[PDB]
């Protein structure tokens, strides 16, 4: 039994080809995993609180309070794009391919090992290690999804990239049900804001505990475990951003006079006056038909209220945004109209020699141009008396109730009849692959997280924990402290994923931006003499296309 | 022709628009044209 090992170790990228533009991108990967024995034992419910910060006046949310159930188990999981792909391999996908389709996913675990630590006292101490055959490892994997769900990166504690370096899973946890309400506050607020907790509604409680649900293959080690392949169900994603904004929807007006000399300050003429132009329009009184005012088949994007926190069971939380900041060059900070900004560390950047610790941060803009730029928006009466007098219209400079930061733009919305937008572009390699789809019946039209969504059910996760041991002592069903033999165990892990894509084709006269090395990043790709690594972010949606 | 395939860890130089030549590709209001030269052998490979 022990005298064999059944596994293989693969990180490869192989391009198999078919007829007529359909190309299977088949990527594999693997990692080495080390796993501490969980120090706790029983399932554990905890409520976290920090209030001096919500106590002091102001501080809308610098934090809230949550309650979770911490299992001893731990989660090895896929669903990053740094687990399988390489910024070397990533190139040939995004330059040649206009679309993706998802197919199939599978995992297996092979050649487990279990070790042991015996800590001497009178010795220095030195740590003895004797490989233990008869100890055991637990593997619990469900394809039913019944037990509750998370992906992981809302943080990116996910498996480390590169396949020479080990990586660790993370302890597994999920939200419980409480109630909280929090009243506003600011610097000038007097009295008390009345911040209170609020127990738990007993009507609704979920303790979900996998040992009450899903089987568990147990392993001493010669043995392997393999999950069969569970397919996906999805819709494709476009790799090609849409530049045309509400200006480019239509046929442009006809110039009646064409300019002359080469070199430019040279401006053509619309050739008619503003009064006599001919065309369709929507407006209160038109002797005016402009490049601006005119009927367009529909809008693009939506103006959304930004930084508005609606209250609920958890009270304060942020209301997300589905668009990019494209067209707005003057508002940055981090992600002004919203540009999801990843913060990770020590594991996929902030080059791998970093003394102490400190997070890593980059604002990821959109490469899609849909203008939501709030500045330069206002409203008129229906009379259209031009030039307009200050008393008959609005500006972003006008308060609400006598305030300043608010313009009017913080309270607005449209979205309704004519709007549309493009599915959120995938990001890399801190992003996410697939996402489970909501349980209710109205099925939001997208997610500001994942590119792809299983419309039926997504494949599950892989849970693992060391098997317990006792020496001699015990009490039955006791939350007192039972002694233990400190151990740990390593197991290799493999993964496979299947893609389908189509080659794009030129039909333009122009070349198109690609990713490539230069001297801007000269070496962001090549290791540092201590072994340094980064894998800087890279923006992929590179391909402009027609829209309407 | 045959499609190449990655086997490296690095991306590779390609041709593309930038601002160096911002418009060497787009006509001039009189009808100007250039078609500036372009250097193509772009792909490094192993030798021995």
């Amino acid at each position: 039994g022990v005298g064999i090992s059944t596994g293989t170790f693969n990180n490869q990228t192989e391009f198999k080809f078919l007829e007529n533009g359909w190309v299977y991108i088949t990527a594999n990967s693997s990692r080495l995993v080390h796993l501490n024995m969980p120090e706790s034992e029983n399932y554990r419910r905890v409520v976290v609180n920090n209030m001096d910060k919500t106590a002091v006046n102001g501080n809308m949310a610098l934090d809230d309070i949550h309650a979770e159930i911490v299992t001893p188990w731990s989660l090895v999981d896929a669903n990053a794009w740094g687990v399988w792909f390489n910024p070397g391999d990533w190139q040939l996908i995004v330059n040649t391919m206009s679309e993706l389709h998802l197919v199939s996913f599978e995992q297996e675990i092979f050649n487990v090992v279990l070790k042991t630590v015996s800590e001497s006292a009178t010795q220095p101490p030195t740590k003895v290690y004797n490989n233990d055959l008869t100890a055991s490892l637990m593997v619990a994997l469900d394809s039913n999804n019944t037990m509750p769900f998370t992906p992981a990166a809302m943080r990116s504690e996910t498996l480390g990239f590169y396949p020479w370096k080990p990586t660790i899973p993370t302890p597994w946890r999920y939200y419980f049900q409480w109630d909280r309400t929090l009243i506003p506050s600011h610097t000038g607020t007097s009295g008390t804001p009345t911040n209170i907790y609020h127990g738990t509604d007993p009507d609704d409680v979920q303790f979900y505990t996998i040992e009450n649900s899903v089987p568990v293959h147990l392993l001493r080690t010669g043995d392997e475990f393999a999950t069969g392949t569970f397919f996906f169900d999805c819709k494709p994603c476009r790799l090609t951003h849409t530049w045309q904004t509400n200006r480019a929807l239509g046929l442009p007006p006809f110039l009646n006079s064409l300019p002359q000399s080469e070199g430019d300050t040279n401006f053509g003429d619309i050739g008619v006056q503003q009064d006599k132009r001919r065309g369709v329009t929507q407006m209160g009184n038109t002797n005016y038909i402009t490049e601006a005012t005119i009927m367009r088949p529909a809008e693009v994007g939506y103006s959304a209220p930004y930084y508005s926190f609606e209250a609920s069971t958890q009270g304060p939380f942020k209301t997300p945004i589905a668009a990019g900041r494209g067209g707005a060059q003057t508002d940055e900070n981090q992600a002004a109209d919203g540009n999801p900004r990843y913060a990770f560390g020590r594991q996929h950047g902030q080059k791998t020699t970093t003394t102490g610790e400190t997070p890593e941060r980059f604002t990821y803009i959109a490469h899609q141009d849909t203008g939501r730029y709030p500045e330069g928006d206002w409203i008129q009466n229906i009379n259209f008396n031009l030039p307009v007098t200050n008393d008959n219209v609005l500006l972003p400079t006008d308060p609400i109730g006598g305030k300043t930061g608010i313009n009017y733009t913080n309270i607005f919305n449209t979205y309704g009849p004519l709007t549309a937008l493009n599915n959120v572009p995938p990001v890399y390699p801190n992003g996410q692959i697939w996402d489970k789809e909501f349980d209710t019946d109205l099925k939001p039209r997208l997610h500001v997280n994942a590119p792809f969504v299983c419309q039926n059910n997504c494949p599950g996760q892989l849970f693992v924990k060391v098997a317990p041991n006792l020496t001699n002592q015990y009490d039955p069903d006791a939350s007192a402290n039972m002694s233990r033999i400190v151990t740990y165990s390593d197991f290799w892990w493999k993964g496979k994923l299947v893609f389908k894509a189509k080659l794009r084709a030129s039909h333009t006269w122009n070349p198109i931006q690609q990713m490539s090395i230069n001297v801007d990043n000269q070496f962001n790709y090549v290791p540092s003499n201590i072994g340094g690594m980064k894998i800087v972010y890279e923006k992929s949606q590179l391909a402009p296309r027609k829209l309407y | 022709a045959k499609l190449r395939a990655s086997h490296t860890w690095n991306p590779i130089q390609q041709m593309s628009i930038n601002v160096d030549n911002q418009f060497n590709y787009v006509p001039s209001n009189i009808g100007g044209m250039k078609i500036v030269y372009e250097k193509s052998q772009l792909a490094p490979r192993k030798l021995y």
Partner: nanobody
Amino acid sequence: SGPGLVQPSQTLSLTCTVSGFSLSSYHVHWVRQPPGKGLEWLGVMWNDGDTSYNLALNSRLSISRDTSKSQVFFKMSSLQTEDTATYYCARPELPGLTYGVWFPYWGQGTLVTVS
């Protein structure tokens, strides 16, 4: 540019580093006499431009290295001199159209180029 006659090559370069706002595209090489003149204010190449007398063409990449070129030859028999080339470099035009207009500061006084 020169020196000196009748139409030799190159020798106009400044300034590195941090040569201005990269708007696609910008100036200013100072320009010109100073009593004149001059120079209807560079675009970006295929086709965006350009200056007011033929063979005055300008080209450069606004990325780093931030540089300039040529410039240029051109027709020098008029004994004119602008030998620098220093920046800030307001709004070019092309971009512009405020209307226009205005030009804050400059740098690096007299450089004179021979006839």
